[PDB]
Design an enzyme around this catalytic site. Sequence first.
Site, PDB file in Angstrom:
ATOM      1  N   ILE A  52       8.765  -3.123  -8.893  1.00 36.75           N
ATOM      2  CA  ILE A  52       8.572  -4.034 -10.012  1.00 36.75           C
ATOM      3  C   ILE A  52       7.314  -3.774 -10.767  1.00 36.75           C
ATOM      4  CG2 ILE A  52       8.814  -6.378 -10.897  1.00 36.75           C
ATOM      5  CD1 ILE A  52      10.023  -6.989  -7.975  1.00 36.75           C
ATOM      6  N   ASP A  63      -3.257  -0.852  -5.421  1.00 36.87           N
ATOM      7  CA  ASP A  63      -2.145  -0.717  -4.490  1.00 36.87           C
ATOM      8  C   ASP A  63      -2.583   0.009  -3.242  1.00 36.87           C
ATOM      9  OD1 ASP A  63       1.175  -0.932  -5.007  1.00 36.87           O
ATOM     10  OD2 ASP A  63       0.558   0.369  -3.301  1.00 36.87           O
ATOM     11  N   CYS A 104       1.163   1.439   0.707  1.00 38.14           N
ATOM     12  CA  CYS A 104       1.935   1.367   1.918  1.00 38.14           C
ATOM     13  C   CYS A 104       3.395   1.503   1.647  1.00 38.14           C
ATOM     14  CB  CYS A 104       1.671   0.063   2.684  1.00 38.14           C
ATOM     15  SG  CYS A 104       2.449  -1.424   1.988  1.00 38.14           S
ATOM     16  N   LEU A 108       4.556  -7.628   1.540  1.00 36.41           N
ATOM     17  CA  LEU A 108       5.724  -7.019   2.200  1.00 36.41           C
ATOM     18  C   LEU A 108       6.965  -7.866   1.772  1.00 36.41           C
ATOM     19  CD1 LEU A 108       4.293  -6.153   5.699  1.00 36.41           C
ATOM     20  CD2 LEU A 108       4.327  -4.809   3.544  1.00 36.41           C
ATOM     21  N   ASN A 147      -0.135 -10.025   5.311  1.00 41.13           N
ATOM     22  CA  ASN A 147      -0.111  -9.440   3.972  1.00 41.13           C
ATOM     23  C   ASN A 147       0.165 -10.451   2.818  1.00 41.13           C
ATOM     24  OD1 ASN A 147      -0.269  -6.246   3.798  1.00 41.13           O
ATOM     25  ND2 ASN A 147       0.752  -6.725   5.738  1.00 41.13           N
ATOM     26  N   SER A 156       9.686 -15.868  -5.306  1.00 35.58           N
ATOM     27  CA  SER A 156      11.035 -15.559  -4.807  1.00 35.58           C
ATOM     28  C   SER A 156      11.913 -16.774  -4.783  1.00 35.58           C
ATOM     29  CB  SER A 156      10.932 -15.151  -3.333  1.00 35.58           C
ATOM     30  OG  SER A 156      12.230 -14.988  -2.837  1.00 35.58           O
ATOM     31  N   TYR A 207       9.482 -13.947   5.876  1.00 40.41           N
ATOM     32  CA  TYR A 207       9.287 -13.502   4.527  1.00 40.41           C
ATOM     33  C   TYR A 207       9.387 -14.720   3.609  1.00 40.41           C
ATOM     34  CZ  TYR A 207       9.969 -11.856  -0.177  1.00 40.41           C
ATOM     35  OH  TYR A 207       9.867 -11.628  -1.519  1.00 40.41           O
ATOM     36  N   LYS A 212       6.393 -16.781   1.225  1.00 43.79           N
ATOM     37  CA  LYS A 212       6.404 -16.949  -0.247  1.00 43.79           C
ATOM     38  C   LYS A 212       6.128 -18.394  -0.643  1.00 43.79           C
ATOM     39  CE  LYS A 212       6.611 -13.837  -2.626  1.00 43.79           C
ATOM     40  NZ  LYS A 212       5.965 -12.549  -2.970  1.00 43.79           N
ATOM     41  N   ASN A 229      17.450 -10.805  -7.073  1.00 38.63           N
ATOM     42  CA  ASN A 229      17.674  -9.364  -6.935  1.00 38.63           C
ATOM     43  C   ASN A 229      17.404  -8.428  -8.101  1.00 38.63           C
ATOM     44  OD1 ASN A 229      18.982  -9.474  -4.072  1.00 38.63           O
ATOM     45  ND2 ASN A 229      20.313 -10.829  -5.267  1.00 38.63           N
ATOM     46  N   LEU A 281      21.689  -4.607  -1.741  1.00 37.66           N
ATOM     47  CA  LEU A 281      22.988  -4.120  -2.054  1.00 37.66           C
ATOM     48  C   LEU A 281      22.955  -2.931  -3.007  1.00 37.66           C
ATOM     49  CD1 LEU A 281      25.982  -4.642  -1.517  1.00 37.66           C
ATOM     50  CD2 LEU A 281      25.925  -6.117  -3.639  1.00 37.66           C
TER      51      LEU A 281
HETATM   52  N1  LIG Z   1      12.390  -6.350  -4.421  1.00 34.01           N
HETATM   53  C1  LIG Z   1      12.931  -7.547  -4.151  1.00 34.01           C
HETATM   54  O1  LIG Z   1      14.151  -7.625  -3.812  1.00 34.01           O
HETATM   55  C2  LIG Z   1      12.116  -8.798  -4.259  1.00 34.01           C
HETATM   56  C3  LIG Z   1      12.762 -10.153  -4.453  1.00 34.01           C
HETATM   57  C4  LIG Z   1      11.773 -11.256  -4.462  1.00 34.01           C
HETATM   58  C5  LIG Z   1      10.478 -11.039  -4.687  1.00 34.01           C
HETATM   59  N2  LIG Z   1       9.845  -9.774  -4.696  1.00 34.01           N
HETATM   60  C6  LIG Z   1       8.375  -9.698  -4.712  1.00 34.01           C
HETATM   61  O2  LIG Z   1       7.933  -8.852  -5.721  1.00 34.01           O
HETATM   62  C7  LIG Z   1       6.782  -8.147  -5.260  1.00 34.01           C
HETATM   63  C8  LIG Z   1       6.911  -6.694  -5.584  1.00 34.01           C
HETATM   64  O3  LIG Z   1       7.921  -6.252  -4.759  1.00 34.01           O
HETATM   65  P1  LIG Z   1       8.616  -4.902  -5.115  1.00 34.01           P
HETATM   66  O4  LIG Z   1      10.066  -5.031  -5.128  1.00 34.01           O
HETATM   67  O5  LIG Z   1       8.097  -4.192  -6.309  1.00 34.01           O
HETATM   68  O6  LIG Z   1       8.332  -4.035  -3.741  1.00 34.01           O
HETATM   69  P2  LIG Z   1       7.393  -2.790  -3.573  1.00 34.01           P
HETATM   70  O7  LIG Z   1       7.065  -2.611  -2.136  1.00 34.01           O
HETATM   71  O8  LIG Z   1       7.952  -1.570  -4.252  1.00 34.01           O
HETATM   72  O9  LIG Z   1       6.024  -3.108  -4.315  1.00 34.01           O
HETATM   73  C9  LIG Z   1       4.945  -3.708  -3.531  1.00 34.01           C
HETATM   74  C10 LIG Z   1       3.717  -2.798  -3.617  1.00 34.01           C
HETATM   75  O10 LIG Z   1       2.567  -3.422  -2.996  1.00 34.01           O
HETATM   76  C11 LIG Z   1       1.905  -2.547  -2.160  1.00 34.01           C
HETATM   77  N3  LIG Z   1       1.339  -3.371  -1.110  1.00 34.01           N
HETATM   78  C12 LIG Z   1       1.958  -3.978  -0.041  1.00 34.01           C
HETATM   79  N4  LIG Z   1       1.084  -4.665   0.742  1.00 34.01           N
HETATM   80  C13 LIG Z   1      -0.137  -4.533   0.083  1.00 34.01           C
HETATM   81  C14 LIG Z   1      -1.420  -5.017   0.361  1.00 34.01           C
HETATM   82  N5  LIG Z   1      -1.800  -5.755   1.397  1.00 34.01           N
HETATM   83  N6  LIG Z   1      -2.425  -4.609  -0.449  1.00 34.01           N
HETATM   84  C15 LIG Z   1      -2.133  -3.778  -1.495  1.00 34.01           C
HETATM   85  N7  LIG Z   1      -1.006  -3.263  -1.829  1.00 34.01           N
HETATM   86  C16 LIG Z   1      -0.014  -3.700  -1.022  1.00 34.01           C
HETATM   87  C17 LIG Z   1       2.925  -1.508  -1.695  1.00 34.01           C
HETATM   88  O11 LIG Z   1       2.260  -0.238  -1.516  1.00 34.01           O
HETATM   89  C18 LIG Z   1       3.865  -1.432  -2.924  1.00 34.01           C
HETATM   90  O12 LIG Z   1       3.579  -0.409  -3.894  1.00 34.01           O
HETATM   91  C19 LIG Z   1       6.491  -8.593  -3.829  1.00 34.01           C
HETATM   92  O13 LIG Z   1       5.701  -9.752  -4.000  1.00 34.01           O
HETATM   93  C20 LIG Z   1       7.876  -9.076  -3.413  1.00 34.01           C
HETATM   94  O14 LIG Z   1       7.756 -10.110  -2.397  1.00 34.01           O
HETATM   95  C21 LIG Z   1      10.666  -8.664  -4.665  1.00 34.01           C
HETATM   96  O1  LIG Z   2      25.070  -3.757   2.945  1.00 33.07           O
HETATM   97  C1  LIG Z   2      25.178  -4.809   2.329  1.00 33.07           C
HETATM   98  C2  LIG Z   2      24.142  -5.474   1.606  1.00 33.07           C
HETATM   99  C3  LIG Z   2      24.409  -6.630   1.017  1.00 33.07           C
HETATM  100  N1  LIG Z   2      25.690  -7.212   1.011  1.00 33.07           N
HETATM  101  C4  LIG Z   2      25.912  -8.455   0.262  1.00 33.07           C
HETATM  102  O2  LIG Z   2      25.390  -8.310  -1.017  1.00 33.07           O
HETATM  103  C5  LIG Z   2      25.025  -9.614  -1.564  1.00 33.07           C
HETATM  104  C6  LIG Z   2      23.613  -9.460  -2.027  1.00 33.07           C
HETATM  105  O3  LIG Z   2      22.959  -9.131  -0.800  1.00 33.07           O
HETATM  106  P1  LIG Z   2      21.384  -8.990  -0.682  1.00 33.07           P
HETATM  107  O4  LIG Z   2      20.850  -7.751  -1.299  1.00 33.07           O
HETATM  108  O5  LIG Z   2      20.968  -9.196   0.723  1.00 33.07           O
HETATM  109  O6  LIG Z   2      21.086 -10.298  -1.639  1.00 33.07           O
HETATM  110  P2  LIG Z   2      20.466 -11.675  -1.315  1.00 33.07           P
HETATM  111  O7  LIG Z   2      21.171 -12.383  -0.202  1.00 33.07           O
HETATM  112  O8  LIG Z   2      20.750 -12.340  -2.655  1.00 33.07           O
HETATM  113  O9  LIG Z   2      18.849 -11.564  -0.918  1.00 33.07           O
HETATM  114  C7  LIG Z   2      17.755 -11.443  -1.901  1.00 33.07           C
HETATM  115  O10 LIG Z   2      17.254 -12.745  -2.385  1.00 33.07           O
HETATM  116  C8  LIG Z   2      16.715 -13.630  -1.307  1.00 33.07           C
HETATM  117  C9  LIG Z   2      16.600 -15.099  -1.835  1.00 33.07           C
HETATM  118  O11 LIG Z   2      17.603 -16.090  -1.253  1.00 33.07           O
HETATM  119  C10 LIG Z   2      15.512 -12.996  -0.485  1.00 33.07           C
HETATM  120  O12 LIG Z   2      15.392 -13.646   0.807  1.00 33.07           O
HETATM  121  C11 LIG Z   2      15.627 -11.433  -0.298  1.00 33.07           C
HETATM  122  O13 LIG Z   2      14.327 -10.795  -0.177  1.00 33.07           O
HETATM  123  C12 LIG Z   2      16.499 -10.667  -1.353  1.00 33.07           C
HETATM  124  O14 LIG Z   2      16.742  -9.281  -0.970  1.00 33.07           O
HETATM  125  C13 LIG Z   2      25.219 -10.623  -0.424  1.00 33.07           C
HETATM  126  O15 LIG Z   2      26.351 -11.485  -0.581  1.00 33.07           O
HETATM  127  C14 LIG Z   2      25.285  -9.703   0.838  1.00 33.07           C
HETATM  128  O16 LIG Z   2      26.137 -10.275   1.861  1.00 33.07           O
HETATM  129  C15 LIG Z   2      26.766  -6.612   1.657  1.00 33.07           C
HETATM  130  O17 LIG Z   2      27.911  -7.071   1.678  1.00 33.07           O
HETATM  131  N2  LIG Z   2      26.446  -5.441   2.291  1.00 33.07           N
END
Ligand SMILES: NC(=O)c1ccc[n+]([C@@H]2O[C@H](COP(=O)([O-])OP(=O)(O)OC[C@H]3O[C@@H](n4cnc5c(N)ncnc54)[C@H](O)[C@@H]3O)[C@@H](O)[C@H]2O)c1
Ligand SMILES: O=c1ccn([C@@H]2O[C@H](COP(=O)(O)OP(=O)(O)O[C@H]3O[C@H](CO)[C@@H](O)[C@H](O)[C@H]3O)[C@@H](O)[C@H]2O)c(=O)[nH]1
Lengths: 338, 338
Positions: free
Chosen positions: A12, A31, A34, A83, A99, A124, A149, A153, A179, A200
Site C-alpha cells: 500500500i 521502512d 522486513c 505486521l 510491532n 482495518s 492482528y 488494530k 481487501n 485471495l
Molecule cells: N494488505 C492487507 O490485506 C491489509 C488489510 C488491512 C489493513 N492493512 C494495513 O495496511 C498497512 C500496510 O500493509 P501492506 O498491505 O502494505 O503490507 P506490507 O507488509 O507490504 O507493508 C508494510 C511495510 O511495513 C514494514 N514494516 C513492518 N513492521 C515495521 C516496523 N516495526 N517498522 C518499520 N517498518 C515496518 C514492512 O517492511 C513493509 O514494507 C499495515 O498497517 C496493514 O495492517 C493491510
Molecule cells: O485460498 C483462499 C483464500 C481466500 N478464500 C476466500 O476468499 C474470501 C476473501 O478471503 P480473504 O482474503 O481471507 O478475505 P477476508 O476474509 O475478507 O480478510 C481480510 O479482511 C479482514 C477484515 O474482516 C482482515 O482480518 C484480514 O487481514 C484481510 O486479509 C473469503 O470468503 C475466503 O473464504 C478462499 O476461498 N480461498
Amino acid sequence: MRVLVTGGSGYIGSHTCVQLLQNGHDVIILDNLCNSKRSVLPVIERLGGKHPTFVEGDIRNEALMTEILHDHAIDTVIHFAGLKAVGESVQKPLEYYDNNVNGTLRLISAMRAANVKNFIFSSSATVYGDNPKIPYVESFPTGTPQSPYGKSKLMVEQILTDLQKAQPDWSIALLRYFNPVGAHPSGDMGEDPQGIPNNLMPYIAQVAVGRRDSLAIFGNDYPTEDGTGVRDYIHVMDLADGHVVAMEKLANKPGVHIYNLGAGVGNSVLDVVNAFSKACGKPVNYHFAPRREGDLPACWADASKADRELNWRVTRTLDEMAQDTWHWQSRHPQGYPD
Amino acid sequence: MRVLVTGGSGYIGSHTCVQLLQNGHDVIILDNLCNSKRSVLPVIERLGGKHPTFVEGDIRNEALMTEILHDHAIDTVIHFAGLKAVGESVQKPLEYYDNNVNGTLRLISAMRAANVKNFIFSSSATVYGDNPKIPYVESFPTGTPQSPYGKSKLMVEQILTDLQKAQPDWSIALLRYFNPVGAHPSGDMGEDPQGIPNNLMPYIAQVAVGRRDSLAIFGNDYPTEDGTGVRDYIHVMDLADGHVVAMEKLANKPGVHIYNLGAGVGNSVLDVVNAFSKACGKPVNYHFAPRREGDLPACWADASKADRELNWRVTRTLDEMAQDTWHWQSRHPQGYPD
Ligand SMILES: NC(=O)c1ccc[n+]([C@@H]2O[C@H](COP(=O)([O-])OP(=O)(O)OC[C@H]3O[C@@H](n4cnc5c(N)ncnc54)[C@H](O)[C@@H]3O)[C@@H](O)[C@H]2O)c1
Ligand SMILES: O=c1ccn([C@@H]2O[C@H](COP(=O)(O)OP(=O)(O)O[C@H]3O[C@H](CO)[C@@H](O)[C@H](O)[C@H]3O)[C@@H](O)[C@H]2O)c(=O)[nH]1
Ligand SMILES: NC(=O)c1ccc[n+]([C@@H]2O[C@H](COP(=O)([O-])OP(=O)(O)OC[C@H]3O[C@@H](n4cnc5c(N)ncnc54)[C@H](O)[C@@H]3O)[C@@H](O)[C@H]2O)c1
Ligand SMILES: O=c1ccn([C@@H]2O[C@H](COP(=O)(O)OP(=O)(O)O[C@H]3O[C@H](CO)[C@@H](O)[C@H](O)[C@H]3O)[C@@H](O)[C@H]2O)c(=O)[nH]1
Ligand code: NA
Ligand code: NA
Ligand code: NA
Ligand code: NA
C-alpha cells in the site's frame, strides 16, 4: 506538505507514495524492510516523477522517529508500518502486539516530542468484529476482533482516540478497509508476497501463473447468491488515493476522522475467480473446501461517508483489479529484485 | 518458589511480599520507585521475617528483565507494576499505555526469552466495563472500559490470553478486583498516597486525620438502600493472600485462570464513612455532591469461583479495613520516610 510515510516501501505504501509525489508533496519513507525490498524505491521515484527520501529503520525506535520528524520537518504522518498476517498473528501474538501496538505508541510518542499533530492511520475493517449488520458503517460501534492482528488494530484505534482526546489539537484519521488488490497501471509495482499468499487475489494469481495447482474455496453453501463468501475488494490505487485525500483534507482539522474506504459492494469468491480467468486468458483452477472457521457468508463496507465528506469514491473495477494484477505478474514474474 | 514481584514496593505488592516471605518463598522485588519509596523495604523484610532482594528498575526495560529472570532463576512472576490513577489516565493516556500495555509486553517477552512460564497478573474489575448484571462473574464476557486505565488492563488481559494460547505451556492468572483497602495489622505498612487520594477510603482517612476538610459524596439519589453508591472493598491483606494462593496453586497448571477477588458484597459510601468514624473515634466530615459522571449505583464482584477453586475467601471485615487504616495513619502520620 511534508509527509512521513511509515511502511512506505510496502504494498500500500509504495502506491501511496507514488501518488503523493505526483501531487508534489515531499515524501520521507521509513521502512524496516522486513516485508519489502529497497528495489521498489527507484520504481517509486520513477513512477512518482520525484524523489522520496528513504530511511531504513523501525517504528519501535522512538529516538530515531523523533530525529526523522525533526530532521525533515514533517507536517503529517501516514502510518502503514506493521505486521498484517492474520494466521501468523495467532501463532506469534507478541510480535504483532509489539510491532502494531507498541510500534504505533512509540511512533506517536515521538510525534508528541517533535510537535507533529497530523496522523493518518491505515486501519482495518476487522475492528467492526463480528457485526451481523452489513454493510458496516462508521457509526456502528466496534466489536471484538478474532485474531491478535485484528485486536492490535482496534487497540491502536483506541489509543489514538484517547490521545486525541487528551491532546485535542491533533487531527487523526482512522482509515478502515478490507481487501486491497491490484497494482499500479504500469505493471511495474504490485503485491510481492513471500511465501503462501493469505489473500485471495494473490493466491489466485499465483495459481494462475502456474506456481499453485488449485484454489481451495472455503464453503459453497453460504446464504449467498452463488454460495461462496462475499467480500470487499478495493483496488490498491483507489485506496492509495483515499489515503492522499484524507491526508490533504484532514491536515489541521482537529478530531478523530473515521472513514471506511471501499467500493461499497461485495464480490463472491467465484466472481473474483472468473474476473481473474478473464484477465489471464485462461480458466483459473479451483476446488471446493469446507467453510473456513470464523467466516461470515458476506461482508462489506459502506463507503458513503468518504464520498460525502472527502468527495472520494473508487474508480477502478474488479476487472481492472485483476488485469493490473496479472499485468504486474506478467512484467515482473520474479517480483522485486534482490 | 522463586518469585519476581514487579511493583513489589507498592501498596499491594508490599503486603503481598510480606506474606510471600512468611510462606518461605524467595522474593525478588523489581520496582522503579515511581510511586513508592525504598524505605518500605526494610519494613517488608522485618514483617516478613526474611530478606527479599530489591532491584530498582523498569518493566519496560526488556533486557534488564531478562537478566533478572535468569539471575534469580525465577519460577513465577507477580505483576503489580503499572500506573493506576484513572483520572490521570484520561489526561495522560500515552503514559498509561506505555507503562501498562508496553510494560507488560516487554515483561512477558523477557519471560519468554528466559524461559519463565508462570505469571500472576494483578488485573482489575474495570474490565467488565459497563455490565448492568451484578454481581460480576468471571463467566460474563468483558465490556469496554471507560478510561485509558481500564482499557489498558483489558488489553493486557487479551495479550496474555493470546500468548497463552500460542504458548500453551504457560500458566496465567488474571486476578480481578476492585477496591483494596486497609493496612498490615502492625500499622507499620499501608497506603501512602502522594497528592489527593483518588480512592474513597484514603480520602476519608485524610479528612479524618485533619488534612482534608470534608468528603464530597457524589450523589445521594441512587437506587440504593441509602442512596449513595455501592462498591466493593477488599482488605489489602486478604487480596495479598489471594495473590499468594493463586501463585502457589496455579504454578505449572497450564491455562488462563480468571478469578475475581473480593468479599462478595457491596458497601455504600455512608457505610464506609460510618465504619471510619467508628475507627477514628470521631465523626468523619462529609457533604453531598452530584452524581459523578459514569458511575453506576452499585457494583460488586461475585467471588464464588476463587472460594471453590482456590479455597480462598476473605477473612477481614469492613471495620477492620478501617481500623487498620486508621492504625497506620496513627503510627506513621507522615507515611514512609524519605
Ligand atoms: N494488505 C492487507 O490485506 C491489509 C488489510 C488491512 C489493513 N492493512 C494495513 O495496511 C498497512 C500496510 O500493509 P501492506 O498491505 O502494505 O503490507 P506490507 O507488509 O507490504 O507493508 C508494510 C511495510 O511495513 C514494514 N514494516 C513492518 N513492521 C515495521 C516496523 N516495526 N517498522 C518499520 N517498518 C515496518 C514492512 O517492511 C513493509 O514494507 C499495515 O498497517 C496493514 O495492517 C493491510
Ligand atoms: O485460498 C483462499 C483464500 C481466500 N478464500 C476466500 O476468499 C474470501 C476473501 O478471503 P480473504 O482474503 O481471507 O478475505 P477476508 O476474509 O475478507 O480478510 C481480510 O479482511 C479482514 C477484515 O474482516 C482482515 O482480518 C484480514 O487481514 C484481510 O486479509 C473469503 O470468503 C475466503 O473464504 C478462499 O476461498 N480461498
Ligand atoms: N490500588 C487500586 O485501587 C487498584 C485497583 C485495581 C488494580 N490495581 C492494580 O494493582 C497493581 C498494584 O497497584 P497498587 O495499588 O499497589 O499501586 P502502587 O502504585 O502502590 O504500586 C505500583 C508500584 O509499581 C511501581 N511501578 C509503576 N510503574 C512501573 C514500571 N514501569 N516499572 C516498574 N515499577 C513500576 C511503582 O513505583 C509502585 O511501587 C497495579 O497493577 C494496579 O493497576 C490496583
Ligand atoms: O471523594 C470521593 C471518592 C469516592 N466517592 C464514592 O466512593 C465510591 C467508591 O469510589 P471509588 O474509590 O472511586 O471506587 P470505584 O468507583 O469502585 O473505582 C475503583 O474500581 C474501578 C473498577 O470499576 C477502577 O476503574 C478504579 O481504578 C478503582 O479506584 C463510589 O460510589 C464513589 O462515587 C465519593 O463519593 N467521594
Ligand atoms: Na485533558
Ligand atoms: Na522475488
Ligand atoms: Na500455535
Ligand atoms: Na510522606
